Amino acid sequence: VGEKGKAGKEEIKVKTEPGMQDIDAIDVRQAIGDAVREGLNLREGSDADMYVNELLKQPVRLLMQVLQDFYTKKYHATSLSVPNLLRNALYGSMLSSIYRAGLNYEQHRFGMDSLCKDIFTYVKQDRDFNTGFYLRPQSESEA
Amino acid sequence: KIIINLFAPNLPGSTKEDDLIQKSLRDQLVESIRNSIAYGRNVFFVDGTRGAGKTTFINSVVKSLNSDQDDVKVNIKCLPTIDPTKLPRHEPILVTVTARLNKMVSDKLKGYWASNDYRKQKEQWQNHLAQLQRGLHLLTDKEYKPEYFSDALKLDAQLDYSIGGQDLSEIFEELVKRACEILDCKAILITFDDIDTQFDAGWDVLESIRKFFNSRKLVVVATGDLRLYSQLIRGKQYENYSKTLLEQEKESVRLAERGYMVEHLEQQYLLKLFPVQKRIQLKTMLQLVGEKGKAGKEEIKVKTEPGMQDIDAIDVRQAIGDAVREGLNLREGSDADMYVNELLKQPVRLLMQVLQDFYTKKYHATSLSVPNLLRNALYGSMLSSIYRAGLNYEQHRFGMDSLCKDIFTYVKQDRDFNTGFYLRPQSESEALRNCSIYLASQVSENCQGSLSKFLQMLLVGCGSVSIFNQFVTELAEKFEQLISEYVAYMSVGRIESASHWANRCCAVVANSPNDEKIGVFLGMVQLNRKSRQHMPGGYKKFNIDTENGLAKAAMASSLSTVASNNLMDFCSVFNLIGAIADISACRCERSAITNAFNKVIAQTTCIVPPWSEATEFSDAITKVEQWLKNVNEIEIGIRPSALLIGKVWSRFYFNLNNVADQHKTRLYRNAEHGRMASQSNAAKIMRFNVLAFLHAVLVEESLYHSVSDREYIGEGLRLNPVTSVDEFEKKIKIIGEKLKADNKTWKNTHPLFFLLISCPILHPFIFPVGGINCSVKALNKETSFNKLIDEIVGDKLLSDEEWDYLTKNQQIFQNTITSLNSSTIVGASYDKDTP
Amino acid sequence: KIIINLFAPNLPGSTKEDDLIQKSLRDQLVESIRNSIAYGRNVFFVDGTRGAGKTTFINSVVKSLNSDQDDVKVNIKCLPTIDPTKLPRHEPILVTVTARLNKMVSDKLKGYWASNDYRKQKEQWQNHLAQLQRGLHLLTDKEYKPEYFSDALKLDAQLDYSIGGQDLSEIFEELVKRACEILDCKAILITFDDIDTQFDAGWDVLESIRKFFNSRKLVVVATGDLRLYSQLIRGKQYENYSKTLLEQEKESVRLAERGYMVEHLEQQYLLKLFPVQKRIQLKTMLQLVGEKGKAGKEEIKVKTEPGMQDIDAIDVRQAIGDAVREGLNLREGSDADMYVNELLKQPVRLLMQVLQDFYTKKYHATSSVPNLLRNALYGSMLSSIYRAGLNYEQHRFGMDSLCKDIFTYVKQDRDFNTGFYLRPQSESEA
Amino acid sequence: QLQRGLHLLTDKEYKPEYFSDALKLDAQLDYSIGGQDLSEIFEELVKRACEILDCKAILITFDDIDTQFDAGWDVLESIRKFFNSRKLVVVATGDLRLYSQLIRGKQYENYSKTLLEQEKESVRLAERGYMVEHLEQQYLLKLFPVQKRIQLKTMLQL
């Protein structure tokens, strides 16, 4: 798909709602973009596309199941809390990375006792106490 | 409407409808299962930790699917749930599935009547089974026989399999297809139970699912914990590495890259088997019933009594609330509901066994000691956590001595030396979190119904860890040796008496030589045992014989000497409190009360800790005997918690820090007979040391004592009295009228403060002759202070002429201290005077 | 109220009435056992860290349930107590349970005289016995043989196995169900003894309870140190982890999460096997009689002299206080109660033997009191004397022997300041 | 009958074909439990031998295991299993530190080797040592009661 603009060999379009046609489909980069800027409460810019490019590098099996989970719960729930849907979608796909990093994984701990502790463990492994707490995808490890 | 009957067996097998905790997910999974067929491997994963109710969940799913299977558009037949742990250790899963599939098919043939169709579809079934038996060795073979090549090259069948060879998945795939034709179903459900009991045998479940269960006629529902399957999958990708490569490349650079590869093959092995869009997370009991403000997504009710009506059944959070609040002697609020929330986040089996054990014995006890019921209920459930964390486990030794040791050995692992004695469920580890609610039940059980055990837990239990957060922690395996020495020196866990703890507690605050060398400490003041020159004013070496009656008794209970290169002598408030903790334990007999004043005064030798470089007395006994009469009838209605004892120590410790340093300066020449707030002496420091304890008890009694639901201090800044009395006077004044407003007495709402403010041991320390802040207008506060105290206890502490001597600028004092002001404090320079 | 005569042949078995201390707890457990079968895994744990007379309590339950079958609404036939540490190293517990179930059932068949169901049920009984023999290889097989697959598909069973295949837990539960009908009872009781001697053999007990003894006509009473089952279960969950993973992921973060995972598997294994509401704690004498601060939940009296009557009896707290105060030459007070409380925390069979060794010998002397208590303790407390390293040779007693022991006591007690008081404030039970 | 049940002592695995042998109930046995209990068959041998030999008891005498103390485990296991009869008296010699050396070695063999390798922290390692030490005493005090032990005197004591 490439960067913004055409910038790519293949024009991949994706359908995010049942009953949709081949004409009103959305770009795969944009579909990741909408799920990221709405899910992470971000605006359009370099930071949003930094997550989008990181998500695009992910394996297609991991990438589709993020898209499949996000856009199948979204349609059913709304026939909102968009960050909740993305959190559940990223919980399953990145689960093996969450387990390795030592992050809290019990779904009943999802407050800030887990969260405020979670980013301290993450930054500790990132070995970057300066810019670690932005939670940027700037690490050198896939986990 | 979900009602759980605690007196029912409550087992996964013996759980009918109308009490399924997971009723929203049971319906959601079943419709999602039918949707998949009505529209490739089809695997649904029901996630959840151990004890979440995964067996109870699938057991309901099969029940809700086998009912009206033919009465719905999509017919799905379900095999009996396969438990991977209970199967033979070497029996292949494909064998178990086929064996359970054969029974379902054969039972259907016996239901047919047309022998032509019966025989037509039975020869095929027997042919497929006989072909599965022929190729079954492909799984259970440790080598490949050369004569099996003929089997792969045989085409003597009408099957005409797509791919060549003796593919076992292909044989099973048409075997399922034949079974669906016979059973007249569009799909077949293969439910797999969890592997949590023995997870090494769950690998065969995983491999079988991805190899033989790829058909469109098969629906696979497997439960368990993905945290547990990940360790199983990760440990099997490590077996794909040659042992020689692992041995020859043990250095970090290549070892870390292999670990990155294994976590990156594990990640997609789970994503291949259990797709994220099909996983279902089992909701813990907290997420169903919700919090007080958040809407409860479900409605769980509990039948806490046999024969209880459906309407009579109470809410589960209330049922846990009753057990937690009454069991821990804790009042409605944030602290009580913090324990309730933690019990809800527990695994369902653990939580449903705390309630089952508590309410079974609670009803049986009546046919009370509710904290005893919860202590036993939590002991059994959290026993695995108690063993792991090293707490006391024998039940014949439960007591105050075996509890204060547990509190110290808990905060040491918790590393929360500032608030660990609160015993809140805040520790990150689940083992320490589980012990927190069990320890809180231990504290609320032993200290309940007795004032003596309340003060022992206050000093020995809560205090010992604070006397470690300071004065011992600067010396820090060495830390575990420091712990070993400190608990052996102070003899926590085997204390002879509360007073004996205080004398040892005196040395540790003393064997830490403070700056400025002044012998004024946290809650204890050093006094000279020798006389020299250079002493101005009336200051003199302390002499016990000067005091009379209670005045002599009050110091005798407070004086504590430690044997060193020179015999230090101290007058602490811990000794005074420890003396109170000793008198309350004994009986109202006069003989036992006398020994309480004489357990330490002249028969102890407090050697310094190893971590160091080097008659009218009968009237006094009568007052204590009268007070002990009050204690034995008032302390029977006391409900102290681990939070209250932890809180009461916290304020009492903070005040002793303020009065320690705010009086380290005001030790000037004219400080004797101190009347302004800028002059202080041994009678000033000890007065506010004692008044600190009477305040910490007072302020957080109404705040936290379970006997009075309401709050009687009201709303305001809860400042504590240091070098003053208005802070204590403001609260004690405003509390009095509220009880008159509510038609309640001082003794049935604040029993702790009523007992300690009426204790004759500390009465001489409330109004010492040296310690009186009789200012131009502040004397009115103390005049009111005396009036309020005289009314609370019901007896006038000081007579009209007795009071006037303290305020107005001889007289003999049988109820107040006399010579404490004249005492010389070690390390004090009596050369600079008050400006 | 229990009243014990100290002049008797001292038979732990002949004790049936007015002499068994734990009757109050035994009746409650037996009633709980009967109530648990009215409505399913029924596993009862008789807990205790050390001593307390475990084997006699479960045997007393067997006697209470083997007798009085006519009066009770539900009658329970009890297998003889199974000692897991006194069995062949490879014999499964399922074989041991069935063999003792066969012995009970076959002996009942000889009791039949109506020779119509005598051979009708016996023929059915041997059908289940032989079928369990056929499927017994599933517990001892070191590999799976394809020839077994034909056996698992044999659907000629007349007893209608609901779930297909050879499931021993399904075969055994029908074997028990037939056994209950033959014995004219319900809910056969299986009792297990302690595994203290060799707790490696207790894992087969645990795996057999959860797998084969899950029937609703089966109630299990287990005994032993529950702290020792925890070490048994926890060590078996580490076996699930592959040896390659353990020796490759050796980081502290990876090792901690592996231990924490097993901390949770072990925790739920005990809760599933031994439910908290079903665990039974053997009450000590101090709890039964009270601390003398207030009235106790039970009153127990002792016949110090031969010929004492019902009213001519004193409380154990007084009988112990009489021995301690006279034996230790102690005055009545707080320090004398420090010894009676510890003497009341001891196992009952140990405690009443000290009383018998003291009071009865005090009679024969009448026909020094301190040596009578010393002799009474030495007879029954000798195990701790040897363990701590004190002087056990009775001919060598003296101040030279005594003062050496007292310095040896304070050396182990780690307290030289107040060690020479000899107050039972130590930590070790010895 | 004892020879029939001797395979239980020496078997590397349980053989299902002996299950039918454990169900061969007999009338002359009058055994309390019929699960082919070797400790019960041997008790009848001792009871019968006393009748034949006209003795009130039988003294089983064991020497010491100083030369090879591995062989002492079979002595301890046999004593506590088969030599519990009232008509049997057992006298065993040997260093009690050597016999305690045996049991402590065998009590550690009950622990799974994986548990010992993985849980090597001092907080858990010391807890195991407290338990194994507790297990060897209860094993020793139940095999050789303290009131029956006899200590040989040296020259100084003589």
Ligand SMILES: Nc1ncnc2c1ncn2[C@@H]1O[C@H](COP(=O)(O)OP(=O)(O)OP(=O)(O)O)[C@@H](O)[C@H]1O
């Ligand atoms: N719907 C329910 N109604 C009542 N009690 C329940 C329910 N679900 C769970 N419980 C309680 O929780 C316990 C755990 O049940 P279950 O056996 O399903 O859990 P699990 O640990 O996930 O399964 P497994 O036994 O297969 O390891 C039950 O024994 C019961 O006490």
